[PDB]
Amino acid sequence: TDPRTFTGLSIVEDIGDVVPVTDNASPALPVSLTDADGNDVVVEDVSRILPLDLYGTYSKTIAGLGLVDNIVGRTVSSTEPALADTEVVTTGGATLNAEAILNLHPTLVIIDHSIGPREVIDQIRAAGVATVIMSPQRSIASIGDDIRDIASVVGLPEEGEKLAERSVAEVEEASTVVDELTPEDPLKMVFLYARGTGGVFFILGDAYGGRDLIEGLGGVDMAAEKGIMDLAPANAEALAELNPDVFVMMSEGLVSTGGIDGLMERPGIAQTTAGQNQRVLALPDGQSLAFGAQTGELLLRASRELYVQ
Ligand code: HEM
């Protein structure tokens, strides 16, 4: 079949919890490290972990390593089922709440600058909480190295190596399937971020890592073609210039703008090729840009929806 003739929404269902590599993780502590901001940190107690980021990666990797039961709080992006009853420590999108964090009496915060404010991260450290700043590479090629970095922090290097190798094998196997499914002329895609029916409506660029998802699905990321390094408002002019064949979206984000019907009301959407085919690939919000352990499964499920009728 010709995937340019497909129409309508394709939605990937929740992939669920990460399968841990062990049921008896025994952290080798203490650990001393210099983090991505240059802070020297001693990690001596991992009993109460806050693994916080915009993308939902760290909570999933921590579970993959065998420490899911140690997670005591989360951001909204960590939507995996195991954490559904775990306290949320952000407000709005991803704004850190110092009071909520400190009231959970964490022993370790793993975080990066995808969320903030920076000043709240500094307050938590000053209050006596061991805080480790990561700067993950967030590419498909670096899935294993990003896992190994997290594993080092919690004193689980062997589990890290197992999880890294398993995840890299899964993502290379998925890529074999993707390559067989892709059309000769790649589909043009964008990652369209939506939250609500108002102005939170953006084409995501380099900083958010959607290019590696789109290219992992065999597509061309029109944001990369046009040099978008952070994000651009998805206004009519931008949409006409990018003119994708498929909008890649987050499932709950799409619901929040009124589903396909609401999306089609937004200026410029209906005039693109994707809009004329009402062609949206919706991915679970908390997996879509998480990469990490589940990347291979995500690529497999998404490529089936893109290329198999
Ligand atoms: C790129 C990765 C991002 C991910 C994975 C992500 C994920 C999420 C998730 C899971 C929620 C909670 C949705 C709900 O429970 O209703 C949320 C809410 C939100 N996001 Fe994002 N988001 C991202 C980027 C952004 C960006 C770039 C902005 C703004 C520039 C933004 C603004 C918001 C806002 C305002 C909310 C609050 C919506 C509400 O009132 O419930 N997000 N996001």
Author numbering: 48 to 356
Which sentences did the original study use to describe this structure?
HmuTUV forms an ABC-type heme transporter system, in which HmuT, HmuU, and HmuV are the heme binding lipoprotein, permease, and ATPase, respectively. CgHmuT consists of two lobes connected with a α-helix, both of which consist of a five-stranded β-sheet and four α-helices. His141 and Tyr240 are coordinated to the heme as the axial ligands and Arg242 forms a hydrogen bond with Tyr240 in CgHmuT. As CgHmuT is a substrate (heme) binding protein that shuttles heme to the cognate ABC-type heme transporter CgHmuUV in Corynebacteria, the regulation of heme binding and release is very important for its physiological function.
The purified heme-bound proteins were crystallized, and the crystal structures of H141A-, Y240A-, and R242A-CgHmuT were determined in the holo-form at the resolution of 1.30, 1.65, and 1.30 Å, respectively. The distance between the oxygen atom of the OH group in Tyr240 and iron was 2.0 Å, which was identical to that for wild-type CgHmuT. The side chains of Tyr240 and Arg242 were entirely superimposable between wild-type and H141A mutants. On the other hand, the conformation of the loop composed from Gly139 to Ala141 was slightly perturbed by the mutation of His141 to Ala, while other parts were almost superimposable between them. A water molecule was observed at the same position as that of the nitrogen atom of His141 in wild-type CgHmuT. The distance between the water and the iron was 2.6 Å. Though wild-type ferric CgHmuT is not reduced by dithionite, probably due to a low redox potential of the heme, H141A-CgHmuT was reduced by dithionite. The ν2 and ν3 bands at 1583 and 1487 cm−1, respectively, are due to a five-coordinate high spin heme, while those at 1571 and 1480 cm−1 are due to a six-coordinate high spin heme. The equilibrium will be present in the H141A-CgHmuT solution for the coordination/dissociation of water to/from the heme iron.
